[PDB]
């Protein structure tokens, strides 16, 4: 058998860039049907179509017991009142967990069960977040600078984006009167 | 079914302390039969019996797909010429991986296959280390201050300390003439 080669990689905690990893880019135009204010979404796409987030991932062959890791740089912004976020997903193998480490900026995680119950966990540098089996998860940038974090997750966890793409999360994170709010999603189908 | 509660915990990157986690302490006297210079080991135990390392672990019920994480504070020191290190272990389920994130200080990882081939990966703050399936792993502090890191690993990986307790690693990390060396272990049985 081949024993895979151990390695180290440099991660820059100031930029989130993983040396040699290769950036994946999600622009606002890649996120139709995600934000509550659909007209605000369309206008910002027309005017700018900004980068919402970038991901640097180091991934193994899909195998039980193995581990992937990735950084994300989630840029600051709003679509209407709603802060920039990641698409969010369940695992394909639902019972897989994740562990996140916040590195820079100010943000948080929205989590949701298949039944639709949602939780918010605030994230500042040094916060480690336990993403349990069976929960979907989305990260949100509530500040004025990039929100940067590292995620470690099973190599065989896979992705279910579709469920979230259709239903969204049951809570949204917005700014009103200069204050950040977590509130029920008015468009939540269930 | 119960969906486990998501949570965040504060990790202090300067001290490695995980809030609320509860310290496990490994003193030099807990490591008989680990260092090459057995007389140097015995003398330092008699004179001081220093703390070699402390671990703060956040662990789940042993279940496929779930994740544990832990910090270690590996203190600076030598037993003779040999730098302080962790005991080191294989997983009980051998094909489980780990991911480490170096936070503070200067150190590195020694890895070894069941066949006895060994690898060294240098670790400074920001270095992420991929610990592959089937490898044993030990961390080493090659500097003058605590070496602090975070590890994420499968909840069902388990521990095999016994193999390492009897055979050691095939390489040692020492200081000679003010320079750090990685060299063959003269006492390596195989
Ligand atoms: O481990 C993870 O889930 C992350 O690396 C995310 O994939 C990343 O933050 C981007 O979010 P999403 O995959 O939901 O678009
Ligand atoms: O994930 C790990 O393996 C670490 O948390 C180690 O357990 C820790 O560094 C202590 O080393 P050992 O378990 O080999 O005594």
Swiss-Prot record, chains A, B:
Q: Which UniProt keywords apply?
A: Cytoplasm, Gluconeogenesis, Glycolysis, Iron, Isomerase, Metal-binding
SUPFAM superfamilies reported for this sequence:
RmlC-like cupins
Where is this protein localized, as stated in its record? Cytoplasm
Q: How does activity depend on pH?
A: Optimum pH is 7.0.
Temperature dependence of the activity comes to: Optimum temperature is 90-96 degrees Celsius. Highly thermostable.
> Which cellular components does GO assign to this protein?
cytoplasm
Question: What superkingdom does the record give?
Answer: Archaea
Q: Which class of enzymes does this protein belong to? A: isomerase
Name the Gene3D superfamilies on file: Jelly Rolls (2.60.120.10)
Any one GO BP annotation for this protein? gluconeogenesis
Activity regulation behaviour? Inhibited by mannose 6-phosphate, fructose 1-phosphate and fructose 1,6-bisphosphate.
Q: In which pathway does it act?
A: Carbohydrate degradation; glycolysis; D-glyceraldehyde 3-phosphate and glycerone phosphate from D-glucose: step 2/4
Write out the residues that bind Fe cation. 89, 91, 98, 137
Principal localization reads cytoplasm
Q: Quote the cofactor binding remark.
A: Binds 1 Fe cation per subunit.
Cofactor entry: Fe cation
Q: Name one GO molecular function term.
A: glucose-6-phosphate isomerase activity
What EC number(s) does its UniProt record assign? 5.3.1.9
Please give the family membership noted in the entry: Belongs to the archaeal-type GPI family.
**HAMAP family in UniProt:** G6P_isomerase_arch (MF_01410)
The record's note on quaternary structure and interaction partners says: Homodimer.
Record protein name field: Glucose-6-phosphate isomerase
Give the source species: Pyrococcus furiosus (strain ATCC 43587 / DSM 3638 / JCM 8422 / Vc1)
